[PDB]
Design a binder for this molecule. Structure first.
Ligand SMILES: O=C(O)c1cccnc1Nc1cccc(OCCc2ccccc2)c1
Length: 210
C-alpha cells in the first residue's frame, strides 16, 4: 500500500539524474551524449538486499550497516544499460531532487570496484524554494577523472560481453542524508551493463527489501 512507484520517498524524490559528455564542438552546435539517464517528470519490483551485499563496501558506510540504520523504504537498486558509443569533451553528472520540506542535503557518491570503495564524492545542496515544493539542484558536476578514464578504457574493449564482465565488478553507491539531522533520505545502489547502442541508455529501478 505504501510501496514506492518511483525512485524516492515521501521526503525526497529523485527528479532527474544523468551522466553525459558534451563534445568539444558543443559550443558550435549543441549535443550531449547520455551514458545513463533517469527522468521522473504499480509498485516497483523488489530485490532482496543481501544478494548485493558483497558488491559494495563493508564495516562502515556499507550496505548492511546503512540498511541497518534505516529507514528500509529509502533503499533502491538501479540497473543501467549504459550507452558507450559517442577525445576531449566535458564529462558531467546532473542530479535534481525535490521535497515538501526545506533541508540541507549531503549527497555522497561512492564508486566501488570488487566491493572496495575506490573514489568518493560528497556534496551538499541547500534547498531552493520554488512553486510550493523545494528543489535541490546539483547540476553539471564534473565527472571525476577516475570515471572518465574508466569510460575511455571501457569503450575500447573489443567485445560487449567483455565490457559486461568488467562492469560485473563495478558499482556506485549514492547516499543522500539530511545534513543537519544525519537521517538517511535516499540510498541508491547502481549496477551496470553496456547497451548494444541502437538502444541508447536504459534503466530498471527496484525497491531493496529484506
Ligand atoms: O560524478 C562523479 O565524479 C562521481 C564520483 C564518485 C561517484 N559517483 C560519481 N557519479 C556518478 C554516479 C552514478 C552514475 C555515474 O555515471 C554513469 C556512467 C557510467 C559509468 C560506468 C559504466 C557505465 C556508465 C556517475
Amino acid at each position: 500500500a505504501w510501496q514506492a512507484r518511483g525512485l524516492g520517498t515521501a521526503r525526497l524524490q529523485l527528479v532527474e539524474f544523468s551522466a553525459f559528455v558534451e563534445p568539444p564542438d558543443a559550443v558550435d552546435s549543441y549535443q550531449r551524449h547520455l551514458f545513463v539517464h533517469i527522468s521522473q517528470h504499480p509498485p516497483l519490483e523488489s530485490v532482496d538486499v543481501r544478494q548485493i551485499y558483497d558488491k559494495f563496501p563493508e564495516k562502515k558506510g556499507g550496505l548492511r550497516e546503512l540498511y541497518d540504520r534505516g529507514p528500509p523504504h529509502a533503499f533502491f537498486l538501479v540497473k543501467f544499460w549504459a550507452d558507450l558509443n559517442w577525445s576531449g569533451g566535458f564529462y558531467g553528472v546532473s542530479s535534481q531532487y525535490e521535497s515538501l520540506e526545506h533541508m540541507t542535503l549531503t549527497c555522497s557518491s561512492k564508486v566501488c570496484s570488487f566491493g572496495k570503495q575506490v573514489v568518493e564524492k560528497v556534496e551538499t545542496e541547500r534547498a531552493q524554494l520554488e512553486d510550493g515544493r523545494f528543489v535541490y539542484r546539483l547540476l553539471r558536476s564534473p565527472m571525476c577523472e577516475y570515471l572518465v578514464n574508466f569510460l575511455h578504457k571501457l569503450r575500447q574493449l573489443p567485445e560487449r560481453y567483455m565490457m559486461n564482465s568488467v562492469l560485473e565488478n563495478f558499482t556506485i553507491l549514492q547516499v543522500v542524508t539530511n545534513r543537519d539531522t544525519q537521517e538517511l533520505l535516499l540510498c541508491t545502489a547502481y549496477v551496470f551493463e553496456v547497451s548494444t547502442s541502437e538502444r541508447g541508455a536504459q534503466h530498471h529501478i527496484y525497491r531493496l527489501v529484506r
